[PDB]
Write a protein that binds this DNA or RNA. Structure first.
Lengths: 215, 359, 23, 35, 183, 165
RNA sequence: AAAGUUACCACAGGGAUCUUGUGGCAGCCAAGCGCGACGUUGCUUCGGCUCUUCCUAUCAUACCGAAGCAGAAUUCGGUAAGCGUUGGACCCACUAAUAGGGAACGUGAGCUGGGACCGUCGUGAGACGGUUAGUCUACUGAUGAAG
RNA sequence: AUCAGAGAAAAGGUGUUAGUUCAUCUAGACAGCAGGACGGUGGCCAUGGAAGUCGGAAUCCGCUAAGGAGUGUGUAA
């Protein structure tokens, strides 16, 4: 017939609407823009969905959809955009930022720790001790049942007597170095929460003031 | 049963393909219309007979491989019934035997019908008809092959217990240290896990003491595993080694262990009983510190006594040239005074006279 | 041939091939 | 059993040429050569 | 298609000449030579960019452009950084005795699975064999030619093959553990 | 050994070092293997792969379809038992016929009470030769009724008929 | 008074004279084009000794793949015809194994074993005859004139 | 075409070339990297036990950008 790569299929039956889903997200963003007040700009961070749900719990809803889709739907030109002076705000509006209604002090001060991801830089240089592996870097008061972790890790570990043993020490991360794929995977496996979620509240789209500060 | 020595049981589809391929590869497959009607009839009959023989041989081998439940020992039969539903296995074997008899009868009827064949098409149709009926019978007996294969795998993996010889049965509360004592006493290393009923199946290990061979058999903590342990202990000439957690570190109270031992006393009757007080540091009463691993050898010796009462040049050669390549010289290993004389040769016979025999 | 079998065919074989094509 | 054209046997013959042969035959030719 | 091209930017490697379809890449680490006479691809050299061009080529010949591009990139990586393969010895009962001769260009293996046969394997040119001191029973295969290094590793693994035994239980052998650059 | 001993061996020692990667490579390259197979193999084994692959596509297409809606002087023919000028072989003779009911759609093995009429020849009807299209009466007490033989007993080897009901 | 009938028919005469491994039947579906594939429901004279080669559709030998394949002994499946595939009476024992076939009348110019017509007497029946009628080449070695 | 070219037929082919139809696509096409892939809920049974993935019936749900009473591996679970 022809030389083409095979495409796999599954039986979840949970396919999103695609174009219709994007249109619904834009409509919800417009409704959020038309919401009462609080003029929030925050959707997600490196944190997990549970953290986002917990953050959204203390509100009366964070929603961005696709990045810059709401800005494109609103329109860069101020005439097309519902707000005022949105031409300069469109360039600033990027990433996972969305409207919400409840806060400012909690966002500024409270930053819950979370597992790090690739692309960042570790704040220290954690070193994995040799010999038997430690789940919490020797802080437990390390189970030997993690046999499948030896194969899944791919690091220089030998399954001796049903226990993963490291022939030589290998640091998980180094200070001043970007988090690699293996480093991020090891940090997620271990107890390395070298991350702190932040929020963006530079300006507020006031109904009357209409002053979105760039601070 | 425990002897195993049974060939793998293929699937129904695999068995049918194997039978057909064997018949095609072995029997000739070139019969033109120019041959006589008798030759055509003979060729079709030969193919049908070869297919029938192959099917019968495989079925007979499968039937013979599975041991008879009645002919097995009472302990082996009880374990097989508890573990693999011996009634279902007997039904499956009977169904396979009936299918084999039906296949042979179908082949005989087809052979008789083809003996009076008329033409090539009639012989070809008759040859196809017999093969399809045999294939239909083989396909019909599908689940029986899968059940037999699973039984064969379980039987092969099962241990070969020897209740006839002196044996020590260690049964009681789960993780009561009896398994640890059995692992220490015997060469076998029984796995121990925090979860209950870690040793689901029995583990048998040979041991030597006082120039005697003792078969240490562990049992699951006391369920299918418990029923198998009870069945094994019911018919076995062995000494009971019930262990009671003195420190109750096994999760079972001393009173609960005593009640279980009293209930199981009917199986332990007419045998030497040992009450092992486990975790002492943490029916003959013997204290064995499970945590401290102290007294296990003394308990084993006491149980054995109760049961008895109730009943270089090579290195140099290998380094130099290895075996079969190194020539060992006997001249060096001589007691001659002069080293030169020992290493030198002498004339055995000269001038028609044996110098060695005349000197 | 070169393969196992002669491409060239017997003259009576060609004709009966033509006959088989006809019917 | 394997025949004399066994590929491993030829490999093992090649290995043993430089172990129990070759040198002890070359100088053997040399000795009767200088003779 | 009329035009099908792949563009490669060259690192500080000195010479990337493709005269007579013979790539002779000279870098800081050394000089590697390969012949690409089996592919009918234009090799245009302009400044710091090399264009692999095929005009009016079929799909079978068009697939050669990327394959040529990768192997040239691989050897350029060799002359700049080099290739290093780390293999870990695996033994259950008999330790595997490994000795290196002619600075490692030939490896002879003994005491495998109790066998008295001395398996002698010679590495391909441009490869050297060393025994790592940081990790025990570790063999390091470093050189310039990635294909030669990988072929040498495959040859060692293929020679140390367990036969007639259950693979599920018998695990003795030599296998590749880490593949990458020298630095 | 005892029970799952390599399962004990896998637990306490581990798996083959590169088994997971080799099984991954084998799965990945299977597509090239199967395509290569479909072109090189010849003969009976090729025809088996042809039939097996055609079947697999059919079920696979259905499973996808089920996915979306969810989202000498002797008688040479078999017969039933001067006038008997010819010879009727005993082996060729049959006494039981597999009659399939029309409305019920169930095949029942009933005895051959007799032959009603053979359209091929009245002599065959007189001789009771079981042939295609012949009418034969069989007992229907457990279900006498007539039935037409829709098969060829001389070739199929069984008297497969359909009830006249 | 006889007449029809005979595929229950019998005795004479006249005319005519590619192959191999998948069961069938009846239904339910049934991609599709009234059929309808794969699936699903039922029930069940010939005959053999030697011999030569040849084919592989491989019994053994060589090497691989898979299987609860621990080892050993196996089973199944590939490449593979290089090399073999006995000795005696369904056996028997040896053996690594005692594989299946071709030479369309395998090798009967290698080899052997296990009448027709006519007549006559004749019911439903079979026998007692007269004629009769066959039909250089190749290979093995050996010399050998000669540019 | 490692058996090119000068009925065996139903089909098979990650062989090639053209088209025909239908789909997504700067609201970012596939592919690849970096992640999420959640909460009731371990829904309900089953049995040494199966927490989506021994198994049998349900197949609900709040949140979202999206997460199944789960695609398979895996786990005694």
């Amino acid at each position: 017939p022809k030389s083409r790569r095979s495409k796999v299929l599954t039986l979840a039956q949970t396919e999103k609407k695609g174009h219709e889903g994007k249109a619904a997200l834009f409509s919800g963003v417009q409704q959020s823009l038309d919401s009462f007040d609080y003029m929030w700009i925050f959707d997600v961070t490196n944190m997990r969905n549970t953290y986002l749900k917990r953050i959204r719990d203390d509100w009366k809803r964070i929603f961005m959809g696709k990045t810059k889709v709401m800005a494109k739907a609103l329109g860069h030109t101020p005439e097309e955009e519902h707000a005022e002076n949105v031409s300069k705000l469109t360039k600033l509006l990027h990433g996972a930022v969305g409207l919400l209604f409840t806060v400012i002090g909690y966002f500024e001060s409270f930053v819950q720790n979370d597992f790090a991801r690739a692309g960042a830089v570790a704040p220290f240089t954690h070193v994995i001790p040799a010999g038997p592996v430690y789940s919490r870097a020797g802080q437990i008061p390390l189970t030997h049942t993690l046999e499948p972790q030896v194969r899944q890790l791919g690091m220089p570990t030998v399954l001796k007597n049903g226990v993963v043993t490291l022939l030589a020490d290998f640091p998980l991360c180094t200070e001043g170095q970007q988090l690699d794929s293996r480093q991020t995977r090891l940090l997620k496996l271990f107890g390395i929460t070298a991350a702190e979620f932040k929020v963006g509240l530079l300006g507020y789209y006031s109904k009357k003031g209409a002053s979105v500060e760039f601070l | 049963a425990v002897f195993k020595n049974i060939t793998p049981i293929p699937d129904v589809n695999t068995f049918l393909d194997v039978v057909l391929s064997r018949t095609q590869r072995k029997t000739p497959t070139v019969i033109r219309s120019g041959f006589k009607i008798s030759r055509i009839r003979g060729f079709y009959g030969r193919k049908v007979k070869f297919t029938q023989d192959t099917i019968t041989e495989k079925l007979d081998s499968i039937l013979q491989e599975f041991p008879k439940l009645n002919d097995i020992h009472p302990f082996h039969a009880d374990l097989l019934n508890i573990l693999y539903d011996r009634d279902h296995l007997k039904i499956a074997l009977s169904q396979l035997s009936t299918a084999k008899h039906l296949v042979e009868n179908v082949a005989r009827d087809y052979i008789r019908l083809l003996k009076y064949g008329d033409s090539l098409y009639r012989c070809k149709q008759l040859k196809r008809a017999a093969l399809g009926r045999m294939a239909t019978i083989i396909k019909r007996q599908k689940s029986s092959l899968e059940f037999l294969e699973q039984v064969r795998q379980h039987l092969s993996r099962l241990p070969a217990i020897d209740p006839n010889t002196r044996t020590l049965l260690v049964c009681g509360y789960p993780n009561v240290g009896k398994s640890s004592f059995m692992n220490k006493v015997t060469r076998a290393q029984v796995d121990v896990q925090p979860y209950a009923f870690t040793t689901k199946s029995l583990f048998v290990g040979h041991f030597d003491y006082k120039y005697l061979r003792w078969q240490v058999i562990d049992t699951p903590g006391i369920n299918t595993i418990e029923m198998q342990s009870i069945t094994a202990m019911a018919h076995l000439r062995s000494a009971v080694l019930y262990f009671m957690d003195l420190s109750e570190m096994c999760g079972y109270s001393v009173a609960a262990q005593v009640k279980l031992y009293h209930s199981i006393k009917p199986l332990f009757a007419n045998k030497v009983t040992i009450l092992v007080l486990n975790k002492i540091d943490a029916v003959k009463v013997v204290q064995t510190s499970c945590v401290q691993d102290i007294g296990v050898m003394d308990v084993r010796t006491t149980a054995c006594e109760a049961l008895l009462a109730a009943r270089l040049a090579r290195d140099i050669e290998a380094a130099n040239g290895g075996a079969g390549v190194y020539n060992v010289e006997l001249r060096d290993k001589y007691i001659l005074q002069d080293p030169s004389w020992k290493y030198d040769r002498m004339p055995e016979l000269l001038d028609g006279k044996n110098v060695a025999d005349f000197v | 041939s070169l393969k196992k079998k002669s491409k060239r065919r017997t003259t009576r074989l060609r004709s009966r091939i033509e006959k088989k094509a006809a019917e | 059993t394997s025949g004399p054209r066994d590929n491993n046997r030829n490999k093992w013959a090649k290995k043993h040429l430089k172990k129990g042969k070759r040198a002890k035959n070359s100088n053997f030719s040399k000795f009767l050569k200088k003779k | 298609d009329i035009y099908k091209d792949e563009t490669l930017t060259i690192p500080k490697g000195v010479t990337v000449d493709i005269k007579a379809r013979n790539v002779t890449v000279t870098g800081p680490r050394g000089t590697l030579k390969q012949n690409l006479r089996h592919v009918d691809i234009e090799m245009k050299k302009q400044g710091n960019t090399i264009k692999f061009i095929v005009w009016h080529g079929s799909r079978k010949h068009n697939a050669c452009i990327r394959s040529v591009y990768s192997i040239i990139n691989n050897m350029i990586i060799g002359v700049t950084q080099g290739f290093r393969y780390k293999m870990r010895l695996v033994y259950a009962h008999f330790p595997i005795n490994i000795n290196l001769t002619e600075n490692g260009t030939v490896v002879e293996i003994r005491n495998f699975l109790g066998e008295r046969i001395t398996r002698v394997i010679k590495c391909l040119p441009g490869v050297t064999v060393s025994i790592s001191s940081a990790v025990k029973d570790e063999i390091i295969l470093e050189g310039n030619s990635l294909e030669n290094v990988s072929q040498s590793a495959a040859n060692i693994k293929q020679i140390c093959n367990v036969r007639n035994k259950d693979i599920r239980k018998f695990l003795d052998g030599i296998y590749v553990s880490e593949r990458g650059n020298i630095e | 050994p005892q029970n799952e001993y390599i399962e004990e061996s896998i637990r306490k020692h581990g798996r083959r070092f590169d088994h997971e990667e080799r099984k991954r490579k084998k799965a990945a390259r299977e597509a090239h293997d199967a395509s290569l197979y479909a072109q090189k193999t010849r003969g009976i084994k090729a025809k088996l792969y042809q039939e097996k692959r055609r079947k697999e596509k059919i079920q696979m297409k259905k499973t996808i379809k089920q996915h979306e809606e969810r989202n000498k002087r002797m008688i040479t023919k078999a017969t039933f038992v001067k006038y008997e000028r010819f010879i009727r072989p005993m082996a060729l003779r049959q006494k039981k016929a597999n009659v399939t009911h029309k409305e019920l759609g169930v095949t029942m093995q009933l005895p051959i009470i007799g032959v009603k009429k053979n359209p091929q020849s009245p002599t065959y009807t007189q001789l009771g030769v079981l042939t295609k299209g012949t009418v034969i009466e069989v007992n229907v007490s457990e279900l006498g009724k007539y039935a037409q033989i829709t098969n060829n007993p001389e070739l199929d080897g069984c008297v497969n008929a359909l009830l006249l009901t």
